[PDB]
Amino acid sequence: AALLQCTADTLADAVLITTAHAWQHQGKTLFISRKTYRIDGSGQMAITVDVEVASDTPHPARIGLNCQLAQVAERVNWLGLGPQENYPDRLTAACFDRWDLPLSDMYTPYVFPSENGLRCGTRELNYGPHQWRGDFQFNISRYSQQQLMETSHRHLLHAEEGTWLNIDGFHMGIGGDDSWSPSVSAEFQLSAGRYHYQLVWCQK
Amino acid sequence: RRDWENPGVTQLNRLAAHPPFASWRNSEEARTDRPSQQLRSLNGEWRFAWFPAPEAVPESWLECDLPEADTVVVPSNWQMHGYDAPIYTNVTYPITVNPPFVPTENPTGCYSLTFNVDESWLQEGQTRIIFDGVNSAFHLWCNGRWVGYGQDSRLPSEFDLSAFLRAGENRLAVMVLRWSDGSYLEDQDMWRMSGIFRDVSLLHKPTTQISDFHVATRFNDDFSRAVLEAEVQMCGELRDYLRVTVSLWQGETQVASGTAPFGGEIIDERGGYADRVTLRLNVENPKLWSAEIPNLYRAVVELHTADGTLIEAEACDVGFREVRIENGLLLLNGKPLLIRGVNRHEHHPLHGQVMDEQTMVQDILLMKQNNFNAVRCSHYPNHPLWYTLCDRYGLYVVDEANIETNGMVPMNRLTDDPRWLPAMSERVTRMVQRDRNHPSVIIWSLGNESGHGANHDALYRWIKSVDPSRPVQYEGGGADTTATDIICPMYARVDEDQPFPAVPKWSIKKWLSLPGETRPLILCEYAHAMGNSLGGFAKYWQAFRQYPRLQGGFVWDWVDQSLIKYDENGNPWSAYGGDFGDTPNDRQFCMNGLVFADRTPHPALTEAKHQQQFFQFRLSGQTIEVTSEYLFRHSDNELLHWMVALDGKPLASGEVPLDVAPQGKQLIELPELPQPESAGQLWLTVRVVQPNATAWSEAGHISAWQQWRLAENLSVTLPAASHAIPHLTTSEMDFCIELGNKRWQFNRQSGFLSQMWIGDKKQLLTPLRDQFTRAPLDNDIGVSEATRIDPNAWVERWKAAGHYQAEAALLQCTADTLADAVLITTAHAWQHQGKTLFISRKTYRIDGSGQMAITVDVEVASDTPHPARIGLNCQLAQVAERVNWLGLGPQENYPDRLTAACFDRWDLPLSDMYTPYVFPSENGLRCGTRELNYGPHQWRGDFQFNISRYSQQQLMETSHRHLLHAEEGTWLNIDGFHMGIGGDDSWSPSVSAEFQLSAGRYHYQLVWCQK
């Protein structure tokens, strides 16, 4: 990320932080992310994200945010598609309802490790003291995308401190018509160019 | 007798049908197709009188001109002369259904003519008169004596007047009935008119004459050899001395000829035809006819004596082509066709159903220029000249019998009834007898919308037996009956099934593979172009290209059937059903064309041209792959032009000669490119241009195009620090923002931007407000009507849900001053009867730069019908001359109808941003727009827009374009999203799901900045 702008403003009943970032590679701008974080008197933080993706870069795997939480809670509760892992082109079996599972169940132990455990069409997610609201897809677990990507076998995965949360506005299909040539269908590729999403983060 | 109320009598004393004759008495004239002194036109001024019923016609009329008659032009439709009203009804018959009777009040046209006949014509030979088209039935008298009667409004009726004429002056009397039992088989969806509407002529033939002739052409496997066979029949006295000679010419060169006395081969135990003979000519490497290269030869048939004295000659254009269905595919000269067709009715806004050469030529040229290669004579045999033009300019034709009994219950009531077979049979047989020698006719059709009856099966088999050279098709009864060689549905969808009982309309892709099915599929009608339509057109093309057995289709239809009427100011205006007092009527359903009545294009036309292109393209790095869809010709009148532009700014362009074989490819390597000196999206646009003029196109004609996005450079450079900061003034009723000479006012009671100033000049006539509806298109209304609502129609869903009546309730309106800007926040709910339909949350950020940034986030209740659009609208105080945008264009384009439009910088007069559909509706949208300029205003973002002098309200309350009146200022509709327009049909919801606004949550943002 290359910071482009970072400002803070005081509102009648809130504080407004505006940011803008660029991700580049060898001088090419791949993505631009513009956000606002509005913190009001109720303790709620409303994050608005507007992203641009260069039309000529390969459509990205996802459009979201991530962070490592200090908290390690026992359960995961959400209002969205479940209870099992589901992806945009693999979610017809999942039902929209209130789901509550132990944390470990939010991780799928594929022998060869990868991105996993996403849940789509979620409107509310609760973990420990935290609560996220909006319309997003998410995964939660003790393994970072970095570790998963670097470990060839599930038995060698190690829980990291805390919990990794990947909350996405958009996520690419997983495909599978075959596993030797690109199989994700156009309609599940993130090729819109401009994407918008919003999340509210709060406590309890 | 009341012959017009008896389907057992369709003519009295009428001569047999045959192919076009001219009775030349000079071979060279026949060869060159020059006018024949033996074929005279009687078109021109005639005498005419109108009566309410046949019983009111005075007998004196038979021998003497009625003083009260008028002199009028013939051919003509009398309704077009104001004698009575033309009637527009679609399915329901214009008369009480009570076959075979017609109303007692039956408008009767009494036509007459006094003309001269040369003595030479009567000293020898036979003089007949020919009525190419009389609607719907008539009796004929000559010199006061009764001659005969005829039915079938769309085929010539011929009568021998040899015994009735005298040298010098003679008087014809023709009593034309508007309604007859033939009207039961004439229920096509078009204006119901009457009169002597096709040519009238006199033909002189010798007593001993060529009475008929049939030309057939067969070939070897690869079409490098052919055999032309001509069967010729004679009437008159057989003499051993008679001979027939058939010669074939290519240009001025005679390539083959054969001569024989009459006397055909043995046919059965009783012998053969002594009055016939068939000549067979070999043709090596014939030049084949196709719509791509309509090569023609001339066959001349001479009847003469052995000593060589000519008796008479006939002749026709011959096109060497084979039509056959094999292994499921319709082949032409052994290659599979891809029909880029259109249905075309014979319609003229001024002249009604009378057709003229100039109009026909204009139609053919526009069709070809727009990539059509075929036409269906919906739904009757056409004026004879039509076939000659299609043979010479090159179009595949479906010739269709004049049989349509749509308004019967059930549809096949008459067609399954044997008492109706005879009337039906002549409508089929007489067509074939007349048109079987035209190369352009490649398929025969049994008629239209008359269910499926046993009569159809009989006639299907008759044609197969008499003319094996052309497939036979018929859609009635489910489009795949035993009476069709082609699955030829009307309005079947690409992917969606419509499982109607008894006559389902399956998805075309699914239809081909039904168990046991093997035929090709070509839609007889699809993409109903009524008003703002052709949404989903590209969907059909993609499928036709991917499935071999999907061989295309015929769009419905070519031209709007509107008629001219004149206002109080004598200003002509376009009229539709009901405008002539006709009732019941089908209102705007008579207007479904790609072009307006005067042949001006509707926007859908370009979508069709683009989808029907004959060259396909692919882009790989710097290589462009061009593939030809021509089956027979090389691209020998084509060059490729390419242009690279950065956000509309030209950067580079070139041309490359195209040399592609039919169905071949060519790879063109593009030049290394300079770099764009700045941020933006680079786009590549290519076009195929024909440098040379052709018989149907001008030099420089653009036949195909395509664009792609190349590199894009995202803008990351921060603008410049503005040195001014806007100021907010708060009052009880408003929030006002001032930035030097500019001001913006937000009303606190409404929650909207109510006024804007540049100096002291107010910019708005109406506040900027959200808009979620549109003035309904014809496809949104479908067959719904006030007196009979169709609750499933989109318009009725929206109406019932209150979308049109919804009122905005303000939820919130606040003002915040930022460091360098003022921030207005609002929220509104649109409710109806207690239900919240939509919620709009917005922010307006105004900074030192004078730009107003608007963000919009809308929630739409999942249970309310998906809205027509999600946008804003306002009435601007300014009226400017031009409209300039960076987006899709230049013509009107919608989400499901935008493939033809290209992304570039466009600039047009404001009036061209309005599409004048006869029945007004939302129109003129342009999509994928990043910048819009109008007067001192500039809007940037990624939206769809329309701009004009008419509000959506006016458009929806005005039923005829001529009654529209420019409002003050300019109405601007800017949409973050807009629903598709549909058009698979105009009677049931046809907007595909992917083009419906069903996301639930929508986000868009715009920046408005001015001078």
Ligand SMILES: CC(C)S[C@@H]1O[C@H](CO)[C@H](O)[C@H](O)[C@H]1O
């Ligand atoms: C309105 C439908 C019930 S019938 C529909 O009407 C159309 C109107 O242009 C065309 O005439 C079609 O051929 C006919 O099938």
Ligand SMILES: CC(C)S[C@@H]1O[C@H](CO)[C@H](O)[C@H](O)[C@H]1O
């Ligand atoms: C004579 C050519 C047009 S086709 C010619 O017809 C022959 C029968 O006459 C045979 O069928 C040959 O195989 C065929 O090539």
Ligand SMILES: [Mg+2]
């Ligand atoms: Mg009759």
Ligand SMILES: [Mg+2]
């Ligand atoms: Mg009909």
Ligand SMILES: [Mg+2]
């Ligand atoms: Mg395109």
Ligand code: NA
């Ligand atoms: Na891995």
Ligand code: NA
């Ligand atoms: Na095909």
Ligand code: NA
């Ligand atoms: Na009506």
Ligand code: NA
């Ligand atoms: Na119609």
Ligand code: NA
């Ligand atoms: Na060329």
Ligand code: NA
């Ligand atoms: Na209207």
